[PDB]
C-alpha cells in the first residue's frame, strides 16, 4: 500500500501479515473458484506493483496457472508498449520487473500503475478460472430427485466460471416452468418448483 | 468505508481483512438464516456502493440467491430512476456505472448512496430468507414430550424468517395456556408450562 | 461506539468485528448462564442504542428469550413515557426504534445508550432466572461429593436465582455446626477438606 | 483502563475483547494455578475498579472461590474504613471496591489516589488465599519416586511450594546419597547436575 | 522495522508478534518450499539487520540448513569487505548484524544495510531450496493416466526449486502437443490435452 | 514497554495480550529448546524490569528451571553490587526493590531493562545446556540415516551445548574424507545425497 507519512511525503507501508496470510489460505482452500478474483482485488486494495508481485509470489502451488498468468501479463505489457512508444512507465515498469518501488510510488496527470497492473492480473486470472472449470454449462442437468434450488445453484456456479435453465430441468419441473410462460423472474421459477 | 486523511480530504480506506473473512465465513456457516441480515448491515457499516459490491462478490456459493438479489436491485434501481456534480441515477447507486470517487463525492445536500444501496440489498436479502425458510408457521406444532421452551424457540424462529402459539401446543400445555386467559405475557406462558 | 473525529465533531464509529464475533460465540457457548450478563455489558461498552440493537439482532437462536426481552423493553419504555410526558427522547427513541443514529448521538447529557442498556440487562436477568434448571432448595451435597464441588454448585444456582449447612451431608454438617456462628466460608471449606 | 482523549480530558477506554476473552479462557484452563495471579495483574494493567469488577464478573464457574474473594475484599475494605475515617470526596472502602462509586469518581481519584491499584492489591491478596487452599498436595508429601528423575521431582516440589534441607530429605536414597555428599552451600544447578 | 517517533527521531519499533509467529509457522509447515522465500521477504519488510537475525534465530529445526546459511553470509560478507576496504563505514560483519549495534544499523539507514543483508539471506536461502528439492527436472515424467494439468503442476514446481515439457509427456498427449507445432502457448497446450 | 504520551511524558504502556499469550504457549510447546531464547528477547522487546518479571511469573511449569534462573539473577545482581534520582542497585535492576516509575526514570541513560534482560538470557542459556538430552559426542549417524538428517541432529545438539566427519557412517565418511580439507557444508551434504 501507500501512505502519507508525518512529514507529508508519500512512503510505502508494508503489507500487513493478515493480508498475506489471508491471500495464501484462500488460494489453498478455494484454488481457482470464481470467488477468488474479488477476494484478490479486495485484499490487494491500493497496492503497488511491488506489492502485487509479493502476493502472487507467495502462492505455493498452481505453478502451471502462475506461468500462464505471466504469459498474459507479458501480452498486456507488449500491448502497453505498442500503444505508448520522471520517466514514462513502460509495460515492464507497470508489471514491477524493471522499476523500483520509489518509481512506482512516483507515478502514483497521476498514473495509477497499481490499478493498471491489477487489471492485467485480474484479466489473466479470469482466463485461468474459465479453464479450470470442470463442467460446461451444457452438461449441468437437474437430476430426478434433485431439488430445483440445488440445480440452479450448480447452474449459475458453472455460468460464473464460463431458456437453457428450463431446457435442462427434469420433466416434472420443466412442465411447471413452461406453464409460467415468458417474463418469469427467477423468484417465480424457484417458488413454482418448491 | 470512508475516512478523512491527514490533509482533511475524504479518501476511501480499504475494507479490512477481518471484515471480508467474517462475511465469507458467516455465509458459509449460516447460509441464509435470519440473523445473517443484521451481520451484513454490521460488517458493511459505513460502506460505499463499491465496498458493498466487494462483499457480495466474495460470496462463493448460493449463486441462485445472488441472481435473485441482482434482480431485486435492478427493480429498486428502476424505481429510483422513475422517481428521479451529476445527479446519481439508479445504476450509480448500485455501483455499476459510477466510479469510487463519484460515490465518495455524493456521500461527503449529502446523498448517502451507500445507505440507499444497502437498503436495497437488505430488502432483497429479506426476500431470499423468506423463500429459503423450510417450514411454515402453520406446521410448527409442539410434540407430546417436547418442552414448551423448545417449541416456542422453533415457533418464533420460523416466524422471524416469514393465538396461534396456543393453538399448536400439545393438549397438556394447551389446557394450561387457556386457563391463564387473555392478556398473558410470554413470560407467564413459558413459566406455566415448565 | 462514539468517537470524536479529527474535526472535533462526534461521529459514530463502527462496532468492531471482534466484538460482534465475540458476542455471537458466547451466546452459542454459554446460552444464558449468569456470566453472560457481565460479558454483554463489557462488549457493549460505550455503545449507542443503534449498536445495542445490532448486537441483539445478530443472536441466532433463543428467539423465545429474545421475544421476552422485547416485552421487558416495551414495559420499561412505557414507564419512561409515563414519567416523562433537539427533541425530548421518548421511550421508543431510547430503545432505538423511532430514532436515527444522529439523534441518539445528539442526546449523548442524556445517556440513551446506558439507559437502554439498563433495560436490556434488566430483561436479561429475568431470562437467566427462568432458564436456571435447579432451584436453590434442591442443591444437596451427595455422600461422596467433596464440599468444594457442592459449594460450587450451590452459589452457581444462587447466582441465577444457614441453608448451606442444612443441605450438606451428615459428615460435613456435623463439622459445620461444630464451628458455630460467625464462621467464614474460608473456615467452612477448610474444615470439610 | 484510562486514556487521555484528543481534547486533553481523561476518559475511560473500553476493555479490549482480547483481554476479556483471555481472562475467561485462562480461568477455564488453569482454574487457580499459581500462574493465574500474574496473568490477572498483567491483563488488568492500568484498570479502574469498574474494570476489575468486569473481569471478575465474567468468570463463570468457581463461585465458591468468588464468594470467598468477596469476603476478603470486604475485610480489606473494613480495614481501609478504619485507617481512614470518613468525614472531590474521600474514597471509602466501598468506593475503592467499585460498589458505591461511579466510573467518573474512580477516574477522578486517579495527591493522586490510585484506587485501581489499591483494589487490585486486595484482589491479588484474596486470590492468593484461594490458590493456597485449592493446592491438592502438601510440601511434606512431595516425595521422589524410585525411578522418578530428579528433574521431575524438583519440578513437582517447587510447584507445590509456589502454591503454599527438605528437598534433600524427600529424595530417594540413590539421589539423597549424592546430594549429601555435595555438602552445604550447593546450588540447585549443582544438585540437578549431580543427579542426572 | 524503523519508525520516526513523535519527536522526529528514527527509532526501532519492535517486530510484531503476528510477524514472528507467522515466520515460525510457515517454516514448520512449508520447510523449504520455493514459496518460503517470498514470504520471508514479505514478513521482513523494512527490517534492520538486528530484526533479520531475530527472525532467523527463532527457527527451531533445520539447523543443517541454517549452518549453510551462515556460511553463505560469511562468503558474501568477505566479498563486501574486499570491494570496500575498511559515522563509521559499515563493514561486512556490521551488515550481518554481528559487530554492530541497533543504533548504528539505524544510523546507516543512505546505506540500506537491512536490504543488503536481506539480499545475502535470500541468496543463501535459494541455495538451500535448490538442494532440498527432491526430484530433478529430468525425472518429472507424466504418467499414463495422469492428467496433463497435474503433470505441468509438478513440472514447473520442480523447475521453480531448480521442449522438455513435451518430451516427458505420455505418448497420448505428446502426439497432440507435437501436432500443435511451434509457437504454442501454455494455455493452448493445456487446453489441447484436457 | 515504554511510550511517550501526548503530553510528552514517558509513561509505561501495558504489555499486549498477544505478547503474553505468545510467551506462555511457546514455553508450553518448546519447553527449553534453544529457539526459546531468541523468542523471549523478541517478545520482551523494549521491556522494563517490571515487564520482564511479568513474563517470567506467567510461566506455569518448569519451576525447577525458574528457581535456577532466580539464583543466576541473584549472582549477577551481587556482581553489579560489587562493581557499583538514586543509583540503581542490583535488586533495583531485577525489579524487586524498585517501582515502575523508578525503572522508567533510569531509562547518562541507564538501560535497566536491557541489563536485566542480559541476566535473564544468560541464566536461560545455562538451563538450555542442562536440559539438552544428548551430548555432541553421542550424535552418530545411523547406517541408513540420510546425511541431511544426521547433520540436522548434529548442529541441533551443538546449539544447546572434524567431529562431523568422525561420527558419520563409513559409507559417507569415505566420501567426506575424499573431499579433503577446506570443504564447505554445502559440498559435504551434496556429496552424501
Numbering used by the authors:
A (entry chain B): 1 to 85, 96 to 118, 123 to 176, 189 to 220
B (entry chain A): 1 to 84, 96 to 119, 123 to 176, 189 to 220
C (entry chain F): 1 to 85, 96 to 118, 124 to 176, 189 to 220
D (entry chain E): 1 to 87, 96 to 118, 123 to 176, 189 to 220
E (entry chain C): 1 to 86, 96 to 118, 124 to 176, 189 to 220
F (entry chain D): 1 to 84, 96 to 118, 123 to 176, 189 to 220
Which of the paper's sentences describe this entry?
Previously reported X-ray structures of HIV-1(M) CA hexamers showed two distinct conformations with respect to a channel at the 6-fold symmetry axis. The beta hairpin structure (BHP) above the channel can assume ‘open’ (His12 forms a salt bridge with Asp51) or ‘closed positions’ (with a bridging water molecule between His12 and Asp51). Inside the channel, 6 positively charged arginines (R18) are hypothesized to mediate electrostatic nucleotide recruitment to fuel encapsidated DNA synthesis.
The X-ray structure of this HIV-1(M) CA + R120 hexamer mutant at 3.29 Å revealed that adding the arginine reinstated the salt bridge. We found that HIV-1(M) CA Q50Y + R120 could only replicate in MDM in the presence of IFNAR1-Ab, consistent with enhanced sensing and innate immune activation. Concordantly, VSV-G-pseudotyped HIV-1(M) CA Q50Y + R120 induced cGAS and TRIM5-sensitive genes in MDM more strongly than WT HIV-1(M) (compare with Fig. 1e, f). cGAS-sensitive gene induction by HIV-1(M) CA Q50Y + R120 was reduced by cGAS depletion in MDM or cGAS KO in THP-1. TRIM5-sensitive gene induction was suppressed by TRIM5 depletion in MDM and THP-1. Importantly, combined cGAS KO and TRIM5 depletion in THP-1 suppressed all gene induction by HIV-1(M) CA Q50Y+ R120.
